[PDB]
Amino acid sequence: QALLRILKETEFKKIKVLGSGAFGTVYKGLWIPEGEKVKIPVAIKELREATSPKANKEILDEAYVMASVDNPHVCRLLGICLTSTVQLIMQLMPFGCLLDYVREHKDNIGSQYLLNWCVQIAKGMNYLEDRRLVHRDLAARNVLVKTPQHVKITDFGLAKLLVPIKWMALESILHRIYTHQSDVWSYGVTVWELMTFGSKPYDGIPASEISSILEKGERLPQPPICTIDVYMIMRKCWMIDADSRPKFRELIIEFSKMARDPQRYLVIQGDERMHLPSPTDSNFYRALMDEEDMDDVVD
Amino acid sequence: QALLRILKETEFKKIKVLGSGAFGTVYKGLWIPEGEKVKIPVAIKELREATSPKANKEILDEAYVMASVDNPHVCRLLGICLTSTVQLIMQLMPFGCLLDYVREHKDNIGSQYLLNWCVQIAKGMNYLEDRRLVHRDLAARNVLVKTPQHVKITDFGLAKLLGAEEKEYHAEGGKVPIKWMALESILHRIYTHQSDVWSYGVTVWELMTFGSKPYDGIPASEISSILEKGERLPQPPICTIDVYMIMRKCWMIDADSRPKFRELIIEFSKMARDPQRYLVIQGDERMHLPSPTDSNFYRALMDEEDMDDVVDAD
Ligand SMILES: COCCCc1nc(-c2ccc(F)cc2)c(-c2ccnc3c2CC(c2ccccc2)=N3)[nH]1
Ligand SMILES: COCCCc1nc(-c2ccc(F)cc2)c(-c2ccnc3c2CC(c2ccccc2)=N3)[nH]1
Ligand SMILES: [Cl-]
Ligand SMILES: [Cl-]
Numbered sequence: 001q002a003l004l005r006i007l008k009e010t011e012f013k014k015i016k017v018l019g020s021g022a023f024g025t026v027y028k029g030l031w032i033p034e035g036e037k038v039k040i041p042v043a044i045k046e047l048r049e050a051t052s053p054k055a056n057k058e059i060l061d062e063a064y065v066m067a068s069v070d071n072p073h074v075c076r077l078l079g080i081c082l083t084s085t086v087q088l089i090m091q092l093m094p095f096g097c098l099l100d101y102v103r104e105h106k107d108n109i110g111s112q113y114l115l116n117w118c119v120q121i122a123k124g125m126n127y128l129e130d131r132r133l134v135h136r137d138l139a140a141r142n143v144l145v146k147t148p149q150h151v152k153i154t155d156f157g158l159a160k161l162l163v164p165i166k167w168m169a170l171e172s173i174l175h176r177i178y179t180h181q182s183d184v185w186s187y188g189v190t191v192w193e194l195m196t197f198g199s200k201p202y203d204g205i206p207a208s209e210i211s212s213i214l215e216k217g218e219r220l221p222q223p224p225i226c227t228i229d230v231y232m233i234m235r236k237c238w239m240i241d242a243d244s245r246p247k248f249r250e251l252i253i254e255f256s257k258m259a260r261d262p263q264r265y266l267v268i269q270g271d272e273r274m275h276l277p278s279p280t281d282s283n284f285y286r287a288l289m290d291e292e293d294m295d296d297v298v299d
Numbered sequence: 300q301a302l303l304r305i306l307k308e309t310e311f312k313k314i315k316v317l318g319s320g321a322f323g324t325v326y327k328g329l330w331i332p333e334g335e336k337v338k339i340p341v342a343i344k345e346l347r348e349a350t351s352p353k354a355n356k357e358i359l360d361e362a363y364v365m366a367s368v369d370n371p372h373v374c375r376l377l378g379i380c381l382t383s384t385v386q387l388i389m390q391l392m393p394f395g396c397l398l399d400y401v402r403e404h405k406d407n408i409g410s411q412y413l414l415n416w417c418v419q420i421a422k423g424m425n426y427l428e429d430r431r432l433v434h435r436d437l438a439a440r441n442v443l444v445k446t447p448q449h450v451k452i453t454d455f456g457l458a459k460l461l462g463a464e465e466k467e468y469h470a471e472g473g474k475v476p477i478k479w480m481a482l483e484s485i486l487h488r489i490y491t492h493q494s495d496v497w498s499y500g501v502t503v504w505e506l507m508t509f510g511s512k513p514y515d516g517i518p519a520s521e522i523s524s525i526l527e528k529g530e531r532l533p534q535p536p537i538c539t540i541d542v543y544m545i546m547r548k549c550w551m552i553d554a555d556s557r558p559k560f561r562e563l564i565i566e567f568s569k570m571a572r573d574p575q576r577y578l579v580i581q582g583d584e585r586m587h588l589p590s591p592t593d594s595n596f597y598r599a600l601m602d603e604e605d606m607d608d609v610v611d612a613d
Contacts, residue, residue: 289339
């Protein structure tokens with residue numbers, strides 16, 4: 001309510017393109033509070049345009065829900081500008097999305113990081129499930145890096161407001177059913193992305209063929225670094241019976257226990273050199289960049 | 300000790316001068332974490348040289364103290380670099396210092412902001428006193444604006460770390476803030492929490508005058524003589540007698556009759572609850588604190604740290 005600021009065009013300015021996705025263009029922008037001289041970096045998403053155009057009131061109804069998401073691992077919509085276009089405003093995260101991060105750090109990311117990211121992503125999805133919010137488009141491209149030790153799910157609620165077949169549960173492909181349990185399937189695929197340092201799922205397979213390969217029983221393969229304990233969580237996320245899939249609450253516990261002994265569940269050549277930040281590197285990161293509460297990381 | 304990151308020259312770059320003061324030069328800087336490609340904006344301060352050949356590990360010991368302060372109204376020192384210079388690193392505050400803030404926004408600043416800044420500054424100084432630290436250079440120039448609703452004290456202990464080499468009989472270009480100092484500090488270089496309280500009084504006066512220079516016209520060389528005769532800074536036109544009386548208590552010759560920071564918190568908190576009764580500012584009803592919507596927005600973008608809620612009007 002008070003959680004969503006409606007902005008006017010004259011109080012911000014887009015200065016650089018940062019990327020784009022199926023729903024809009026992402027800009028680095030500057031917020032200029034009226035009667036001030038400061039320029040405050042912000043992330044701005046200008047929505048693509050109307051598939052079926054939505055009513056202004058419906059756009060705001062949903063923007064309010066997005067602005068009400070209050071969890072250390074889900075990005076909160078901070079503001080909206082409703083003109084001839086829809087522009088979304090959120091706190092800017094300079095590290096970008098987790099998918100690019102694990103690619104650029106291929107073989108050099110420690111197991112402690114990857115299992116902690118799984119924990120955090122589950123915590124954020126668990127929070128959405130407890131609010132009865134269905135994401136519909138969880139994927140590593142929709143997970144953002146505030147700091148290497150703190151990731152956040154983004155783009156909640158856009159899919160409903162405005163197709164990633166290779167991330168979708170089978171019943172979503174067939175019937176366009178979306179539930180917290182189909183979100184769990186996407187979560188399995190997102191974890192598979194992380195553990196392959198950002199491979200494309202079903203790379204070189206045609207989207208048109210995925211429903212066939214799924215009903216056949218084939219799944220994404222066991223990542224090189226993953227012990228069978230990790231891969232079996234992924235498989236359970238991709239069972240045909242949506243109700244047999246794990247629950248996010250359980251995924252939090254499972255990955256948390258794995259992160260407490262990371263090198264037992266992930267086998268990474270070179271895990272010798274990469275660890276979590278020392279207390280001093282952690283305070284430094286947090287004091288400059290990331291002051292919000294949040295739980296402790298699993299050591 | 301895990302509170303202070305020792306930085307190598309190779310990890311950060313100064314990218315733009317922000318200002319300069321008695322203790323050094325401030326830079327907008329960019330921190331580049333080892334193995335990353337992002338550039339994290341920081342505030343860097345390159346200190347002027349100590350007036351005495353300090354051990355260099357004594358410098359680190361005083362820096363550890365500065366990195367240990369944990370309070371929403373005191374800037375924590377985050378890292379340090381010991382090379383050709385002593386360089387200090389902390390979080391960058393785009394709004395700058397409160398002195399510049401009140402000067403540029405004179406006429407647009409309401410009583411609710413002014414009384415709340417007094418509260419927060421006393422809270423920060425109360426915390427330094429609790430940590431047994433004397434600031435020695437409290438002034439509006441050393442209060443930083445995180446958001447308009449959230450100020451923080453900086454530069455504590457730099458006066459002791461760096462010293463001044465008897466530039467206390469200079470005109471005003473001196474590094475020594477004679478016009479903020481307690482009489483006993485001018486006469487005898489005595490610095491206590493109670494002399495900090497006198498400096499606190501001048502800081503309130505700066506704010507209540509929207510950034511006037513204290514004792515303007517009066518040479519600095521003459522300050523101790525006018526203070527000894529009973530002359531004090533004038534009542535700001537916006538101040539009710541109630542506010543001016545607290546400023547005068549801060550400048551009492553007898554150090555232990557000045558107010559305590561813990562009492563100034565209470566007194567200014569009480570005034571902030573009925574602000575138009577203590578400060579008379581034309582057009583004040585148009586200058587309230589931000590609506591919930593706007594402060595929610597300010598916090599999520601700029602100021603995620605936990606903070607005492609501002610004292611709203613009853
Ligand atoms: C190719 O991705 C763009 C699509 C994914 C995405 N949607 C958004 C977004 C922005 C504002 C909103 F209201 C809602 C969603 C972001 C985002 C959000 C916050 N901060 C960021 C970034 C991207 C980013 C970045 C990208 C490349 C290099 C460096 C930094 N920083 N991402
Ligand atoms: C403008 O202060 C008056 C000068 C005193 C000062 N010492 C410091 C300082 C910096 C790094 C340290 F380790 C310790 C102390 C700052 C500071 C601290 C953090 N952030 C900032 C600024 C100034 C500033 C600014 C100046 C002009 C225009 C816009 C913004 N942003 N100030
Ligand atoms: Cl997008
Ligand atoms: Cl200075």
